[PDB]
Amino acid sequence: NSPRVFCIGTADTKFDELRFLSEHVRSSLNSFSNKSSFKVGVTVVDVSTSWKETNSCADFDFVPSKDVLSCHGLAIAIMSKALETFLSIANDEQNLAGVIGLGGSGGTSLLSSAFRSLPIGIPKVIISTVASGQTESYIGTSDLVLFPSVVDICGINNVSKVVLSNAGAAFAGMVIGRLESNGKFTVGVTMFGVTTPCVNAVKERLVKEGYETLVFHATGVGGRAMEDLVRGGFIQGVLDITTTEVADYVVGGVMACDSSRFDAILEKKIPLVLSVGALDMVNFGPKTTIPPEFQQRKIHEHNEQVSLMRTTVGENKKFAAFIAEKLNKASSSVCVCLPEKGVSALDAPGKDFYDPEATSCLTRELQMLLENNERCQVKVLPYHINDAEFANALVDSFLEISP
Amino acid sequence: SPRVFCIGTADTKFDELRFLSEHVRSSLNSFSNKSSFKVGVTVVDVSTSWKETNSCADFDFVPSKDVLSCHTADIRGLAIAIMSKALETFLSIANDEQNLAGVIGLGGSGGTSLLSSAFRSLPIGIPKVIISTVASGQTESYIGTSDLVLFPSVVDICGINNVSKVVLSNAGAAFAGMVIGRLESKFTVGVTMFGVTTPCVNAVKERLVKEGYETLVFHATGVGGRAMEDLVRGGFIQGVLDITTTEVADYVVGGVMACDSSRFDAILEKKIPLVLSVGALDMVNFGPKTTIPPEFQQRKIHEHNEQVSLMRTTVGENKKFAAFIAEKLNKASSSVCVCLPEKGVSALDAPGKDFYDPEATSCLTRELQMLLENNERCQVKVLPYHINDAEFANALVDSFLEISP
């Protein structure tokens, strides 16, 4: 079985741009092969939502809107799932060597969605009219590239010729280069300004024990990035020291995790020590964009830019739910580890967000809620989270679970 | 002979820079088969720390000192500013020997800012890549209207590891592809356009193609205008029918699709055939109602679609628009023809239609030929049609066929 790339667009309206690209890719694939043996099949793919029907492209193996729509603003949402799943499948026969697509606003968003469900490392490219603006929605935590089109996508000219030529070259080199070619155990750890004592320490120890590290700034995306690399198969254990992202979720901060937090790790059945890193705060900023439902709470303006808000006792009770829920479904080994005195630089004896009534409630609540579960151990400990003796715990708890 | 540049802050990112450059070299070489010549990879330090780095593996290497030489408060920023300016000037020189085949870089937040400015001054077409911790955010500041490509770094730049090995590897192969492909190897006009002028442009597009010209159509969105002007400066667009100058409007009143004070200079500096006109000067862009500067809650507010609202320009405002255009036009060191539609400047400024007001349109007309009367390069044609009548369209194209070779 030989390797195959996909050139994907809306074919009814952009046949000429897409033929141009497809041609240039196949050509460039061929010109850049060395060790080779295989040529890479270049198949064009239509994802037009219109009733208009184009059923071949040049000579290329082609696949019309239907064949894609068959796989299980609402026009985009349909066809993108169709693509995503259409691509899930081709990945499986195990010779999807890349994806490429062109598109303006609506199309970019369509492709973006399909492409970034592919394994990190498979080359994902889109020549896009909306590359040069705001791309978070499109790229996210993936490695998707977006080539600015410079001019609109309307037929081949002067400019589109070079721009499309360059992106085909780009994509052909990626795909060959990867056809024509880890060692360590990487762990990943989640950090916040106010929890680095703990994380720095653990990163240190981890390095000396022989393990490699990937720290994530728990910004929601940060968390999700981690899980999308474990899921990928890059991160072989986690120490989720900082779970503040959960707090921003149940009360609605500006750096929330979404409701799938932890699944990816548990689904991949990999060593998972965990803790309450920074559960004491939910994030916002500046003051007036903070909702008027709590202009009477314990806030700590960190910058003009960001503002932190201290989690009430009741809110921490809710954090203990979310985490325990997910934890209790644990298909393999786990270990919670709680700092009793405080969960953050600011939740410190003397400091601004100190409250052990909180961080005791949170400690018990999770001691009880996880009480039954066999795999998930729990270790309440007589420390603050930053005390490097905690760090020893975490790395030790982890050392236990791991090979 | 051709040469590429791997540019970074060696001081802190040495391993990643070397790895990247190694992969670029490999990929260059392997992809170049079949062929001869062979592309040099030059590593270059754009570090602002004093920490000196003087080599990297076996590559022709240029440290900070040597960059900073050829350059023509809050220090960090200032140091970035200068390093960036330095780099820009270093690449220009690199490019003058016609031997700059490509440029690739790595950066975090500040590094993307440093590399970006410097890379987008190089001609469209020369491969320009950056692997960046801030690809997956808000990139207009960096990419502007250029072909700069930002690959998302996926994790931090933070030593070699599984993830950055594959990302860096795909970026270097991407880049080596763009570089070899390009190494191995009419009269275009541009036209500004708004919804309410698509009759006019569509019809001018059609006529021009039949006359044997290629056409590029830019949404007059502020960006669009600059987009076009940078491409004329880079020789991709040899004449312009600037039908729709609505941007000039959003500028003086303060809209969401504002041009800037440089509008027209590129066209004139290139000395290229410029037919111009008053397209959609009857309106100024906002969206939505709710955010419209409270000082006019009484002006004629059109709702186009929830997110986007238009506001009818007053006579005082048109008088100004004239000045801006006149002033800039008067600098013409070459041929230029205005063409004014006497009847209207928009589907919205049409007998029966909301933004009608032939006072504005006469004011504008008179004010323009007044201020250009003396300029004998500019030929102000007043035409008894509406902007969207296919005879105006021919008018435009004739005026253009006139000035052009």
Tell me which residue has tokens 């409701």.
Answer: A259
Q: Which of residues 98-137 of A touch B (CB under 8 A)?
A: 120-121, 123, 131-136
- CATH code for the domain in which residue A91 is found: 3.40.50.12020
Instruction: Identify whether B288 is preceded by a cis peptide bond (ω within 30 of 0).
Output: yes
* CA separation for the pair B127, B149 (Å, rounded): 8
CA B197 to chain centroid, in Å, comes to 22
Numbers of helices and strands, H then E, in chain A? 13, 15
Q: Report which residue type is found at B194.
A: F
**Contacts with B377 (C-beta within 8 Å, 6 or more apart), sequence order:** B332, B333, B334, B335, B336
Q: Among A144, A169, A170, whose Cβ lies nearest the Cβ of B152?
A: A144
Query: Would you tell me how many other CB atoms lie within 10 Å of the CB of residue B50?
Result: 7
Of the candidates B226, B258, B261, which has an alpha carbon nearest to the alpha carbon of residue B242? Answer: B226
Helix, strand, or coil here: A113?
Answer: helix
Answer for the pair A103, A128: CB distance below 8 angstroms, yes or no.
Answer: yes
Residue B283: strand pairing partners? B312
First to last CA, chain A: 36
Measured CA distances, B222 to A212, A236, B145, B247 (Å)? 48, 49, 11, 6
Neighbours of A305 (CB within 10 A): 8
Is the omega angle on the peptide bond into residue A286 within 30 degrees of 0, that is, cis?
A: yes
CA distances for A202 relative to A187, A207, B155, B164, B179, angstroms: 11, 8, 19, 22, 43
* Cβ distance of A150 and B33 shorter than 8 Å: no
Q: Do both B12 and B113 map to the same domain?
A: yes
Say if residue A347 is in the same domain as residue A388.
Answer: yes
- Measured in whole angstroms, the distance separating CA A1 from the mean position of its chain's CA atoms is 31
- Chain B residue numbers with beta carbons less than 8 Å from the beta carbon of A143 are 151-152, 154, 167, 170
Shared domain for A62 and A94, answered yes or no, is: yes
Residue type, A260: S
Residues B194, B170 share a domain = no
Residues 6+ apart with CB under 8 A from B191: B201, B204, B205, B215, B216, B217, B218, B240, B241, B242, B243
Which two structure tokens, joined as six digits, stand for B295? Answer: 């000082």
DSSP E strand stretches across A29-175: 41-46, 62-63, 96-103, 124-128, 145-148
In this structure, which amino acid lies at residue B376? Answer: E
Cα–Cα distance between B14 and B8 in angstroms, integer? Answer: 8
How many Å is the Cα radius of gyration of chain A? 25
Which of these three, A182, A212, A235, is where a domain ends? A182
What is the DSSP code string of A3-38? -EEEEEE-HHHHHHHHHHHHHHHHHHHHHT-SS-SS
- A-B CB pairs within 8 A amount to 176
- Same domain for B235 and B179, yes or no, is no
B219: chain A residues, CB-CB within 8 Å: 152
Residue B36 in tokens: 């001869």
The CATH number covering residue A354 comes to 3.40.50.12030
- What's the domain range around A260? 183-403
For residue A216, the distance in angstroms to the closest alpha carbon of chain B comes to 8
Start-to-end CA distance of chain B, whole Å, equals: 36
DSSP state letter for B313: P
User: Looking at chain A, which residue has its C-alpha nearest residue B165?
Assistant: A182
Spell out a b/e string for A186-198, using b for 16 or more CB atoms within 10 Å of the CB, else e. bbbbbbbebbbbb
The minimal CB distance from B139 to the residues A133, A158, A182 is found for A133
Candidates B139, B217, B237; nearest CB to A132: B139
| Residue B141 sits in the same domain as residue B211 | no
Determine the Cα–Cα distance for residues A298 and A311; give it in Å rounded to an integer.
8
Domain end position, chosen among B136, B168, B185: B185
With both helix axes pointing from N to C terminus, report the angle between A158-179 and B162-183 in degrees, rounded to the nearest 10.
Answer: 130
Q: How far is A120 from chain B (nearest CA, A)?
A: 9
One domain for residues B196 and B167:
no
Count how many residues are written for chain A.
403
Residue B250 and residue B304 in one domain = yes
Which residues lie closer than 8 Å to B60 by C-beta, 6 or more apart?
B40, B41, B42, B43
Strand arrangement of the beta sheet that strand A281-284 belongs to: A281-284, A307-310, A299-301
> Are A125 and A31 in the same domain?
yes
Residue A186: closest CA among chain B residues belongs to which residue?
B162
Q: At which residue do the structure tokens 């890719």 appear?
A: A25
Interface of B with A in 190-219 (CB under 8 A): 214, 216-219
Sign of the Cα torsion A292, A295, A299, A305 reads positive
Chain B's closest residue to A216, CA to CA, is B155
Which residues of chain A make contact with B179, given a CB cutoff of 8 A?
A: 169
Helix extents (H) in B33-105: 64-69, 76-96
Distance CA A9, CA A48 (A): 7
Residue type, B178: M
Co-location of B151 and B247 in the same domain? no
DSSP 8-state secondary structure symbol assigned to residue B307: T
Q: Which two tokens stand for residue B94?
A: 């690199």
Give the end of a domain, one of A182, A205, A226: A182
B198 and B169 together in one domain: no
> Hunting for tokens 């002007």 — which residue is that?
B229
DSSP state string for B237-256: --EEEE---HHHHIIIII-S
φ, ψ of residue B79 in degrees (nearest 5): -65, -45
User: How many domains would you assign to chain B?
Assistant: 2
Report chain B's C-alpha Rg in angstroms: 25
Looking at the structure, tell me whether residues B245 and B158 fall in a common domain. no
Q: Which H or E run contains A178?
A: helix A158-179
